[PDB]
Design a protein around this nucleic acid. Sequence first.
RNA 1: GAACAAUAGUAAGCACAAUCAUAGCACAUAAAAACGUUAGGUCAAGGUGUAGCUUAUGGGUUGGAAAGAAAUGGGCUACA
Lengths: 132, 55, 103, 101, 129, 99
Amino acid sequence: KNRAARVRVSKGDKPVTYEEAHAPHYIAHRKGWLSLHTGNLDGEDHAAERTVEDVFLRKFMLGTFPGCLADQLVLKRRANQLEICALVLRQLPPHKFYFLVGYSETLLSHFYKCPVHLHLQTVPSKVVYKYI
Amino acid sequence: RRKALPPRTEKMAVDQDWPSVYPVAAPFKPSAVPLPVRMGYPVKRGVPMAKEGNL
Amino acid sequence: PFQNGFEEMIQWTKEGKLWEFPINNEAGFDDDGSEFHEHIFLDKYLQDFPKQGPIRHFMELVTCGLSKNPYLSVKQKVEHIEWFRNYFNEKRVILKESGIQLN
Amino acid sequence: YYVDWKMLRDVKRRKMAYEYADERLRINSLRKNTILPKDLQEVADEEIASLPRDSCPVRIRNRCVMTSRPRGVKRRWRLSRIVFRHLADHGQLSGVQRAMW
Amino acid sequence: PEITISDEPDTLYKRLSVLVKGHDKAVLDSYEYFAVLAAKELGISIKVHEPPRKIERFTLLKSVHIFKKHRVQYEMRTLYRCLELEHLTGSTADVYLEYIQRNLPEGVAMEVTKTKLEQLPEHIRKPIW
Amino acid sequence: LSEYAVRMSRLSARLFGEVARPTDSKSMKVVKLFSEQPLAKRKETYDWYPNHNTYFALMGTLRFLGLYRDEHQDFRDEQLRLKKLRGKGKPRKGEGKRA
RNA sequence: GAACAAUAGUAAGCACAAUCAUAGCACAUAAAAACGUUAGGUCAAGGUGUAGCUUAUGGGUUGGAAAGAAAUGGGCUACA
Ligand SMILES: [Mg+2]
Ligand SMILES: [Mg+2]
Ligand SMILES: [Mg+2]
Ligand SMILES: [Mg+2]
Ligand SMILES: [Mg+2]
Ligand SMILES: [Mg+2]
Ligand SMILES: [Mg+2]
Ligand SMILES: [Mg+2]
Ligand SMILES: [Mg+2]
Ligand SMILES: [Mg+2]
Ligand SMILES: [Mg+2]
Ligand SMILES: [Mg+2]
Ligand SMILES: [Mg+2]
Ligand SMILES: [Mg+2]
Ligand SMILES: [Mg+2]
């Protein structure tokens, strides 16, 4: 059996997002891509750094936003600026949300020494594609 | 205190020009988008997932 | 405060944080003010050296090498040829013992 | 904290290999030349031999960045196959798809 | 919008060639529609072609420890679009390529080759040493 | 071949800025030696690892400063809490062996 | 717990099938392959539960290894 990135069949009650309900072999068929940047194209450089950056952005976004992160984090990279798109649950009040928005944008622009832009879209409950 | 305010599609004039609402490069916020759009591989129900909260 | 996304871009670009368009990959790097005949022709620093000796063979290959090199500015090339002068004159004994009189 | 002591010593090998680099290049310039005397070459030999062997290029080992795995490393992504596959399968790796032909 | 006219004789381009690289087809299709419609408005007179796709395939071992009869095969496809502009100016070039470049999608890269028209250099004109 | 060919080639050689006087194939390496960027200097080499001290310390700080949140470190912590509360801890240095 | 001139079975879920990829079809191959089985493999990818080491089971330098009496699996090159 192939165990790569999959969600096993339960008694049938297990809530599942469209993202985790599709096996790796579906990527580019049905599944899109989580990260978007130039680096893996035919003639191009520094894919590695965009990858390190990606990883740390996963870690950072999941540790900065405790319990409220809904679905896996969408990374866009355009004209040197990173557009970080996150689907996030409604947990905390708007004050802390904008606090952490500004906080994150500042710290990420300044660590990566490049302009960062953060887009949050709030969702009532985790999106369920299958089961339930 | 739980806050739910209706999306921009509710306040939008039918003929209001688009470049006003979408001047620059954007994430595609579903709320500000007047056009219904269904993506995602259908379940056997026959429903492509809505334009709302779609990852 | 921001009136538009264009205001965002505009301010980022004045600030020098946003990139410059249409992009030239050489934007922000002036290369010390140098020109090709300061790069290509290294005769200037070959002035002090024995002229007909094999030291000119070795230093002409070093020169022709530092000429073909985009990866280094004027300064470091010069430090190379200078370290070579300093080391060649550092040992006077070897050059003379080897069987060729070398200056 | 670098993930291992392995990655510690190899990082110090990258710093060092950057440091004595000029020395390397200039000494090995004469040492590899035919026209010059053999006598400048024996002395140049003792010279690059004198350098700390931690600063030489080939003592450096390519490892996966995060998981430190010495082998099975993909040069372009600096990532071990375990971690590569892990990342690409979640689709966290851009453009990488499963090959069918 | 501050505009200024310098007396100096603005650069001419015979052929401005723009390579648009991508993974996906759709984005490059749309972007093609974009560059075409943008270069029509400015009366730039352009063509577009599709350079044949290039596919790289490399293989990793499927398991953590040992099964060498079992392999995973991963793929990277690069698809092409090339815009060919003929007989344009330097300013028209800077503007059109500014507009085309600022909006360039995240997954796609762009390589531009400009062949620029120069009459002759000065020491060559008609002296002989 | 001719002397006209040798002189023509020397002309092209000294003109273009390439190697002028005839050399060994061996010595030519030194040409290519300064013609390139040496291996150990390349950014794709010395910059191989991102600084781990940086990310580690930065995120830990941000944690204790109450910005970032590490569930791994919380698992660890809580488990050493239930390890020492049990009485099997990490011995104060120097004490364990001889006593 | 099925019988179609049908006798107690209905069931969304997940496999297989269907579609995708192999630059048009069709085929083929590729992929896909649930549930469980073999306490199958790996604490040396990494991460951890339990136990241990903490002037050491830790961290560094330097030098040293991988020798064939055989026995055999797989290959390459042949015997023209
Ligand atoms: Mg199998
Ligand atoms: Mg090696
Ligand atoms: Mg087909
Ligand atoms: Mg078939
Ligand atoms: Mg198969
Ligand atoms: Mg199938
Ligand atoms: Mg099957
Ligand atoms: Mg066993
Ligand atoms: Mg372990
Ligand atoms: Mg442990
Ligand atoms: Mg030890
Ligand atoms: Mg040793
Ligand atoms: Mg036998
Ligand atoms: Mg054969
Ligand atoms: Mg054979």
